[PDB]
Subunit: 200 residues, 3 copies
């Protein structure tokens, strides 16, 4: 589990093909001495488990993860190539506060940025989400876009807007986002359960 | 408390029947110096208390647990024989990373594997959950199956699917699971809070 | 921080009025050499700081704490008189085992015991929760009642059930608890998250 508070901008070093999957090497500012093997890291909102770390003595700062069929089909990982900057977040530690938005790294699909407009030192992004996600939006709660916890402001069916503040643009990949870009979308976990309960 | 991140594959050494209970001796890779009597260890998702350990200074690596009436009835434990491989997880300590979700080790019942499909080096498992548990299983939600924190992908009535990654298949008992097998199911406690608010709001109006 | 695993039954020796507060002197079985000035101790679920200790060379086994407006308003502290037995728990350190659940020692309010019923070695307590907390008390959920980590056995409107085992009744103030008694209530992190989302 995560909080959607991005702590690093990672970089895709290499993409290696696996049997119906990809091996991703991600460059990070995180100390590999603080990353245990098997740790869960949210990579642009995708929960992935660390499978390899640099050799003892090596000055390299990377971690390796494996993205399989569900992650490839639904997430932006399908388009990831060497040089791609990605949002990073470490798992929530027992004792730390949960905050206003829990993020599990279970992305529903890809939302598309249709408009980017500057509003002072902040940037308003207008997005379109897959049709099936529309009833979860309009509820105007919090959403995880590329692993970033964001408040849903205006809504028109499957179209919605988010306001990215100066700090968020600086410390996340949102500073380089533009119209046409695909982002990972994760609907609020409690809202998922509430909607599933409503079916019965 | 647990997170559903399996850290060892234990092996059932001894199965001893007691008065409405069973004494289980589990061989483990865990350091005996890290385990004290009264410790809680999730055994294939079942929270069990350590009742016996090897002698002070011994190199033997095992721990004993007792599964009573509730555990024997709701869980897969009733079928556990000597040689059975089980998923193991230590209780969360202050400051430990919660890699999965909040897992309590309180198994709600048993889910049956209806299909095992290869997805390259990953494996898709289709499961049938008890009817009562179905409203708590949501698409892209969390579930603890044999104590393993997993993302629920598709859901159709009381049937749902999960994708077991290569890493999980290698470090858990999921690598040997097949169609027809019964697994321990613990629905996400977060779903109970959604059900509670909906129950309170219904009683209100 | 705390886990809800009570380690001592303290006794209130003195209740002294302060300017906009209350000073409490608590007798404890804790080793006096292990209690340092400024240490956090959960007193019937209320996180309070040690303000005074016995002087150099004294054999006395007490500690002093100060309760302010928030604690006096929300907790049972306002009703505490000399001779009152209270649950005690020392603060956790990074890496400590957590036998109960995550307890911050920040009580949300007071729950009232409406019924006490024997069930073999165990005792079933029925409690009335404040209306603001009631929609966030769910079955199988963890709750801190008088600082004791307990599982919610059943729910019904504003009422909920907890089952107190023989050991818990023996080592905590729950053994002397009766119908009509007010207890401190602290909802867990999941309940707090659900309450925060409903508030938003
Ligand atoms: O393919 C993977 N999926 C994993 N999880 C599920 C994944 O997050 C979802 O399939 C994705 O978010 C799309 O829903 C992984 N871990 O959890 O560690 C992992 O390492 N690899
Ligand atoms: O720019 C924003 N940051 C927000 N949150 C903080 C953001 O998640 C972090 O700054 C970022 O993840 C980097 O840590 C928002 N909400 O939480 O709703 C929001 O609407 N906009
Ligand atoms: O039978 C037992 N049940 C226990 N707990 C409840 C058990 O987890 C559930 O009965 C089971 O998960 C089914 O719901 C134990 N501990 O908690 O330690 C234990 O040692 N033995
Ligand atoms: O195989 C998977 N592992 C996952 N997580 C990690 C898994 O719990 C551990 O690898 C395992 O418990 C061993 O530590 C998943 N998600 O978290 O979503 C998932 O969907 N599939
Ligand atoms: O009145 C006090 N409140 C304190 N904390 C907050 C207190 O726990 C809450 O007000 C109470 O639990 C009600 O929410 C103290 N410390 O933390 O040390 C203290 O010493 N005194
Ligand atoms: O009597 C109980 N003790 C429980 N836990 C142990 C209790 O917190 C301690 O015995 C006590 O705090 C003294 O250390 C319970 N749960 O944890 O759920 C419970 O429901 N009932």
């Amino acid at each position: 589990m995560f909080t959607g508070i991005i702590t690093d901008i990672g970089k895709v070093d290499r993409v290696k093909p696996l049997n119906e999957g990809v091996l991703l090497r991600i460059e990070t500012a995180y100390d590999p001495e603080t990353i245990e093997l098997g740790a869960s890291i949210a990579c642009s909102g995708v929960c992935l488990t660390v499978v390899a770390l640099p050799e003892k003595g090596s000055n390299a700062r990377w971690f390796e993860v494996e993205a399989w069929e569900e992650a490839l089909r639904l997430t932006t990982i399908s388009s990831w190539q060497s040089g791609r900057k990605i949002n990073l977040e470490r798992s929530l530690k027992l004792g730390d506060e949960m905050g206003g938005h829990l993020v599990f790294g279970h992305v529903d699909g890809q939302a598309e940025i249709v408009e980017r407009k500057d509003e002072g030192d902040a940037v308003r992004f207008t997005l379109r989400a897959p049709e099936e996600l529309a009833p979860f939006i309009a509820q105007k709660g919090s959403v995880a876009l590329d692993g970033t916890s964001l408040t849903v402001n205006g809504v028109n069916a499957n179209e919605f807007d988010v306001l990215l503040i100066r700090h968020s643009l600086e410390v996340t990949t949102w500073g380089e986002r533009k119209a046409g870009d695909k982002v990972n979308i994760e609907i609020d976990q409690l809202a998922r359960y509430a909607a599933r309960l409503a079916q019965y």
